[PDB]
Amino acid sequence: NNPISKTELRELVLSWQILDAVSLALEDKRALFLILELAGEDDETTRLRAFVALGEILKRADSDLRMMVLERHLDVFINALSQENEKVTIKALRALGYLVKDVPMGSKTFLKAAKTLVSLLESPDDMMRIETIDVLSKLQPLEDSKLVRTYINELVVSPDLYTKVAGFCLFLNMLNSSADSGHLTLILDEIPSLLQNDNEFIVELALDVLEKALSFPLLENVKIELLKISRIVDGLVYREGAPIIRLKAKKVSDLIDSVIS
Protein backbone atom coordinates (compact mmCIF):
# COMPACT_ATOMS: atom_id res chain seq x y z
CA ASN A 1 0.00 0.00 0.00
CA ASN A 2 0.76 3.71 -0.33
CA PRO A 3 -1.39 5.06 2.54
CA ILE A 4 -1.84 8.71 3.57
CA SER A 5 1.17 9.95 5.58
CA LYS A 6 1.39 11.73 8.94
CA THR A 7 2.44 15.08 7.44
CA GLU A 8 -0.39 14.65 4.92
CA LEU A 9 -3.05 14.19 7.62
CA ARG A 10 -1.80 17.22 9.57
CA GLU A 11 -2.13 19.40 6.52
CA LEU A 12 -5.60 17.98 5.92
CA VAL A 13 -6.53 18.64 9.54
CA LEU A 14 -5.01 22.14 9.58
CA SER A 15 -6.67 22.96 6.26
CA TRP A 16 -10.00 22.04 7.89
CA GLN A 17 -10.53 19.34 5.25
CA ILE A 18 -12.05 17.61 8.22
CA LEU A 19 -14.48 15.30 6.47
CA ASP A 20 -11.69 13.94 4.25
CA ALA A 21 -9.48 13.12 7.23
CA VAL A 22 -12.56 11.74 9.01
CA SER A 23 -13.42 9.47 6.07
CA LEU A 24 -9.82 8.23 6.00
CA ALA A 25 -9.57 7.51 9.73
CA LEU A 26 -12.91 5.70 9.74
CA GLU A 27 -11.72 3.55 6.82
CA ASP A 28 -8.30 2.74 8.31
CA LYS A 29 -7.14 2.60 11.95
CA ARG A 30 -3.60 3.65 11.03
CA ALA A 31 -4.87 7.05 10.01
CA LEU A 32 -6.99 7.31 13.18
CA PHE A 33 -3.88 6.55 15.24
CA LEU A 34 -1.97 9.28 13.40
CA ILE A 35 -4.71 11.79 14.17
CA LEU A 36 -4.44 10.75 17.83
CA GLU A 37 -0.74 11.71 17.59
CA LEU A 38 -1.58 15.15 16.16
CA ALA A 39 -3.91 15.56 19.13
CA GLY A 40 -0.85 15.37 21.39
CA GLU A 41 1.49 17.73 19.51
CA ASP A 42 2.79 20.92 21.11
CA ASP A 43 1.17 23.31 18.58
CA GLU A 44 -2.21 24.60 19.81
CA THR A 45 -3.82 24.93 16.37
CA THR A 46 -2.85 21.34 15.56
CA ARG A 47 -4.29 20.02 18.82
CA LEU A 48 -7.51 22.02 18.39
CA ARG A 49 -8.14 20.89 14.85
CA ALA A 50 -7.14 17.27 15.60
CA PHE A 51 -9.69 17.16 18.42
CA VAL A 52 -12.29 18.55 16.02
CA ALA A 53 -11.50 15.72 13.63
CA LEU A 54 -11.54 13.23 16.52
CA GLY A 55 -15.01 14.41 17.53
CA GLU A 56 -16.32 14.03 14.00
CA ILE A 57 -14.75 10.55 13.80
CA LEU A 58 -15.94 9.33 17.19
CA LYS A 59 -19.48 10.63 16.77
CA ARG A 60 -19.61 8.38 13.71
CA ALA A 61 -17.68 5.43 15.18
CA ASP A 62 -19.31 2.23 16.39
CA SER A 63 -19.17 1.01 19.98
CA ASP A 64 -16.36 -1.51 19.29
CA LEU A 65 -14.02 1.07 17.73
CA ARG A 66 -14.66 3.49 20.60
CA MET A 67 -13.86 0.91 23.30
CA MET A 68 -10.55 0.27 21.58
CA VAL A 69 -9.64 3.95 21.34
CA LEU A 70 -10.77 4.31 24.95
CA GLU A 71 -8.67 1.42 26.28
CA ARG A 72 -5.48 2.40 24.43
CA HIS A 73 -5.61 6.18 24.15
CA LEU A 74 -7.76 7.65 26.95
CA ASP A 75 -4.69 9.57 28.11
CA VAL A 76 -4.56 11.57 24.85
CA PHE A 77 -7.92 13.11 25.79
CA ILE A 78 -7.20 13.35 29.53
CA ASN A 79 -3.85 15.13 29.09
CA ALA A 80 -5.46 17.83 26.94
CA LEU A 81 -8.04 18.68 29.59
CA SER A 82 -6.79 21.86 31.29
CA GLN A 83 -8.20 25.18 32.46
CA GLU A 84 -5.19 26.99 30.95
CA ASN A 85 -5.79 26.01 27.29
CA GLU A 86 -9.55 26.48 27.26
CA LYS A 87 -10.25 26.40 23.51
CA VAL A 88 -8.43 23.05 23.04
CA THR A 89 -10.09 21.77 26.21
CA ILE A 90 -13.59 22.40 24.83
CA LYS A 91 -12.83 20.45 21.64
CA ALA A 92 -11.19 17.63 23.66
CA LEU A 93 -14.23 17.49 25.92
CA ARG A 94 -16.59 17.19 22.96
CA ALA A 95 -14.51 14.39 21.49
CA LEU A 96 -14.29 12.68 24.91
CA GLY A 97 -18.09 12.84 25.23
CA TYR A 98 -18.58 10.89 22.00
CA LEU A 99 -15.85 8.42 22.94
CA VAL A 100 -17.22 7.28 26.29
CA LYS A 101 -20.90 7.23 25.32
CA ASP A 102 -22.41 3.95 26.55
CA VAL A 103 -18.94 2.47 27.19
CA PRO A 104 -18.71 0.93 30.68
CA MET A 105 -15.37 1.75 32.32
CA GLY A 106 -13.31 -0.20 34.85
CA SER A 107 -13.19 1.57 38.18
CA LYS A 108 -9.54 2.63 37.82
CA THR A 109 -9.89 4.53 34.51
CA PHE A 110 -13.43 5.73 35.51
CA LEU A 111 -12.00 7.42 38.62
CA LYS A 112 -9.05 8.93 36.74
CA ALA A 113 -11.30 10.41 34.04
CA ALA A 114 -13.94 11.59 36.53
CA LYS A 115 -11.37 13.30 38.76
CA THR A 116 -9.79 15.12 35.85
CA LEU A 117 -13.24 16.24 34.71
CA VAL A 118 -14.26 17.41 38.23
CA SER A 119 -11.02 19.44 38.41
CA LEU A 120 -12.16 21.57 35.46
CA LEU A 121 -15.17 22.75 37.44
CA GLU A 122 -12.77 25.12 39.25
CA SER A 123 -12.92 27.29 36.11
CA PRO A 124 -15.55 30.06 36.01
CA ASP A 125 -15.96 29.68 32.21
CA ASP A 126 -19.60 28.85 31.45
CA MET A 127 -18.85 26.91 28.26
CA MET A 128 -16.27 24.80 30.06
CA ARG A 129 -18.69 23.99 32.85
CA ILE A 130 -21.38 22.98 30.35
CA GLU A 131 -19.08 20.66 28.34
CA THR A 132 -17.51 19.21 31.46
CA ILE A 133 -20.87 18.33 33.02
CA ASP A 134 -21.91 16.95 29.64
CA VAL A 135 -19.02 14.48 29.58
CA LEU A 136 -19.66 13.59 33.25
CA SER A 137 -23.31 12.88 32.37
CA LYS A 138 -22.05 10.29 29.88
CA LEU A 139 -19.32 8.70 32.00
CA GLN A 140 -20.35 5.12 32.76
CA PRO A 141 -18.78 2.92 35.47
CA LEU A 142 -18.71 -0.83 34.81
CA GLU A 143 -19.31 -1.57 38.52
CA ASP A 144 -21.38 -0.24 41.41
CA SER A 145 -18.46 -1.23 43.67
CA LYS A 146 -17.74 0.35 47.05
CA LEU A 147 -14.87 2.20 45.38
CA VAL A 148 -17.12 3.84 42.76
CA ARG A 149 -19.93 4.59 45.24
CA THR A 150 -17.47 6.03 47.73
CA TYR A 151 -16.16 8.48 45.17
CA ILE A 152 -19.67 9.43 44.10
CA ASN A 153 -20.72 9.96 47.74
CA GLU A 154 -17.67 12.16 48.18
CA LEU A 155 -18.82 14.35 45.28
CA VAL A 156 -22.47 14.62 46.39
CA VAL A 157 -21.53 15.72 49.93
CA SER A 158 -19.41 18.56 48.50
CA PRO A 159 -20.70 22.04 49.43
CA ASP A 160 -19.70 23.16 45.92
CA LEU A 161 -22.79 23.15 43.68
CA TYR A 162 -21.38 21.78 40.41
CA THR A 163 -19.23 19.21 42.21
CA LYS A 164 -22.49 17.91 43.70
CA VAL A 165 -24.12 18.04 40.26
CA ALA A 166 -21.21 15.96 38.94
CA GLY A 167 -21.89 13.54 41.75
CA PHE A 168 -25.52 13.25 40.80
CA CYS A 169 -24.65 12.77 37.10
CA LEU A 170 -22.31 9.90 37.95
CA PHE A 171 -24.81 8.41 40.42
CA LEU A 172 -27.43 8.26 37.68
CA ASN A 173 -25.03 6.34 35.43
CA MET A 174 -23.88 4.08 38.24
CA LEU A 175 -27.47 2.87 38.67
CA ASN A 176 -27.12 1.24 35.23
CA SER A 177 -24.49 -1.06 36.79
CA SER A 178 -26.49 -1.85 39.96
CA ALA A 179 -28.18 -5.27 40.14
CA ASP A 180 -30.64 -4.75 42.98
CA SER A 181 -30.16 -1.44 44.85
CA GLY A 182 -31.05 2.20 44.15
CA HIS A 183 -28.61 3.24 46.91
CA LEU A 184 -31.02 5.97 48.02
CA THR A 185 -29.03 6.61 51.20
CA LEU A 186 -26.15 7.82 49.00
CA ILE A 187 -28.09 10.92 47.89
CA LEU A 188 -31.28 11.33 49.90
CA ASP A 189 -30.17 14.18 52.15
CA GLU A 190 -28.57 16.15 49.31
CA ILE A 191 -31.34 15.85 46.72
CA PRO A 192 -33.81 18.37 48.25
CA SER A 193 -31.18 21.05 47.55
CA LEU A 194 -31.19 20.16 43.84
CA LEU A 195 -34.96 19.89 43.66
CA GLN A 196 -35.19 23.36 45.26
CA ASN A 197 -32.58 24.88 42.91
CA ASP A 198 -33.39 27.75 40.55
CA ASN A 199 -31.56 26.17 37.65
CA GLU A 200 -33.74 23.93 35.52
CA PHE A 201 -30.95 21.54 34.45
CA ILE A 202 -30.31 20.75 38.12
CA VAL A 203 -33.96 20.18 39.02
CA GLU A 204 -34.45 17.85 36.06
CA LEU A 205 -31.27 15.95 37.01
CA ALA A 206 -32.62 15.43 40.52
CA LEU A 207 -35.97 14.24 39.14
CA ASP A 208 -34.14 11.85 36.77
CA VAL A 209 -32.16 10.45 39.71
CA LEU A 210 -35.30 9.87 41.79
CA GLU A 211 -37.09 8.13 38.89
CA LYS A 212 -34.23 5.67 38.35
CA ALA A 213 -33.41 5.13 42.03
CA LEU A 214 -37.04 4.44 42.98
CA SER A 215 -37.22 1.68 40.34
CA PHE A 216 -35.24 -0.58 42.73
CA PRO A 217 -36.71 -2.27 45.81
CA LEU A 218 -36.40 -0.03 48.90
CA LEU A 219 -34.74 -1.97 51.74
CA GLU A 220 -34.02 1.04 53.95
CA ASN A 221 -36.64 2.87 56.02
CA VAL A 222 -36.41 6.35 54.54
CA LYS A 223 -40.10 7.10 54.89
CA ILE A 224 -39.51 10.39 56.72
CA GLU A 225 -37.01 11.45 54.06
CA LEU A 226 -39.24 10.51 51.09
CA LEU A 227 -42.19 12.30 52.65
CA LYS A 228 -40.20 15.54 52.83
CA ILE A 229 -39.02 14.92 49.26
CA SER A 230 -42.60 14.12 48.21
CA ARG A 231 -43.81 17.53 49.44
CA ILE A 232 -41.15 19.23 47.32
CA VAL A 233 -41.97 17.11 44.26
CA ASP A 234 -45.69 17.84 44.76
CA GLY A 235 -44.79 21.52 44.56
CA LEU A 236 -42.70 20.93 41.45
CA VAL A 237 -45.79 19.56 39.68
CA TYR A 238 -46.94 23.19 39.58
CA ARG A 239 -43.56 24.83 38.98
CA GLU A 240 -43.64 27.67 36.45
CA GLY A 241 -41.12 27.08 33.66
CA ALA A 242 -40.18 24.10 31.49
CA PRO A 243 -43.07 21.59 31.28
CA ILE A 244 -40.82 18.53 31.49
CA ILE A 245 -40.13 19.36 35.16
CA ARG A 246 -43.84 19.44 35.92
CA LEU A 247 -44.28 16.21 33.93
CA LYS A 248 -41.36 14.36 35.54
CA ALA A 249 -42.57 15.58 38.94
CA LYS A 250 -45.91 13.82 38.35
CA LYS A 251 -44.14 10.61 37.34
CA VAL A 252 -41.80 10.73 40.36
CA SER A 253 -44.78 11.57 42.58
CA ASP A 254 -46.59 8.45 41.32
CA LEU A 255 -43.35 6.54 41.79
CA ILE A 256 -42.94 7.64 45.43
CA ASP A 257 -46.57 6.73 46.10
CA SER A 258 -46.00 3.20 44.78
CA VAL A 259 -42.92 2.86 46.98
CA ILE A 260 -44.47 4.68 49.97
CA SER A 261 -47.98 3.24 49.72
The sign of the CA dihedral 19, 23, 24, 25 is positive
| PDB resolution in Å | 2.0
- Cα 40 to chain centroid distance, Å, stands at 23
Query: Which method was it determined by?
Result: X-ray
Sign of CA pseudo-dihedral 36, 70, 170, 111: negative
Rounded distance between C-alpha atoms, residue 214 and residue 206, angstroms:
12
d(CA 91, CA 51): 6
DSSP symbols for the chain: --PPPHHHHHHHHHTT-HHHHHHHHHH-HHHHHHHHHHTTSS-HHHHHHHHHHHHHHHTTS-HHHHHHHHHHHHHHHHHT--SSSHHHHHHHHHHHHHHHTT--B-HHHHHHHHHHHHHHTTS--HHHHHHHHHHHTT--BS---HHHHHHHHHHHH-SSHHHHHHHHHHHHHHGGG-SS---GGGTTTTHHHHHT-S-HHHHHHHHHHHHHHTTS---S--HHHHHHHHHHHHHHTT-SS-HHHHHHHHHHHHHHHHH--
Q: Domains in the chain, please, with CATH?
A: 1-261 (1.25.10.10)
